[PDB]
Amino acid sequence: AFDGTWKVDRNENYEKFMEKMGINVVKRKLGAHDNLKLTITQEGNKFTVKESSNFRNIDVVFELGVDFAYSLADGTELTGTWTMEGNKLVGKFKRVDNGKELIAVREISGNELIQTYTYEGVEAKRIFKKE
Ligand SMILES: CCCCCCCCCCCCCC(=O)O
Predict the structure, then answer these.
(1) In whole angstroms, what is the distance from residue 111 CA to residue 94 CA?
(2) Which contiguous run of DSSP H or E holds residue 7?
(3) Ligand 1, atom 10: nearest CA belongs to which residue?
(4) Contact at 8 Å (CB) between 67 and 52?
(5) Which is nearest to 9 in space by CA: 113, 122, 119?
(6) Domains located in the chain, CATH noted
(7) Which residues contact 58 (CB under 8 A, 6 or more apart)?
(8) Whether residue 69 has its Cβ less than 6 Å from ligand 1
(9) How remote is the CA of residue 44 from the centroid of ligand 1, in Å?
(10) DSSP class per residue in 89-108
(11) Dist. CA 72 → ligand 1 center (Å)
(12) Is 28 labelled as part of a ligand binding site?
């Protein structure tokens, strides 16, 4: 499953995606080399994601199908839910400032974790390798 420690390996169109979100040139360069690592653990229907990066270290806890709030490193607030679809986790979120939709998907491909995002017509991916 998703269980395990994952470390980012490569990105696809991440800087353009961050530009759309409103992130400055400098912060995009730092964002793209954030050394993000995720430690995922499950307990029933609830997941615990320990996010660790050059920017911060925090725990994210969520129950499938129940909305929760999550903030980006820069303070941008989102609210949404994750649900299990087939073998994938599909996340439906909204920016609380502008009300715009942001979708995220987590899926396993071989031994890699692929995280895809879409926002205002732009797609980006972050691919992680298992530790
Ligand atoms: C510099 C800003 C990068 C923005 C990337 C989009 C973040 C959306 C991901 C949603 C994650 C929710 C918490 C989780 O399940 O780990």
Answers:
(1) 30
(2) strand 4-12
(3) 104
(4) no
(5) 113
(6) 1-131 (2.40.128.20)
(7) 50, 51
(8) no
(9) 22
(10) EEEEEEETTT--EEEEEEEE
(11) 6
(12) no
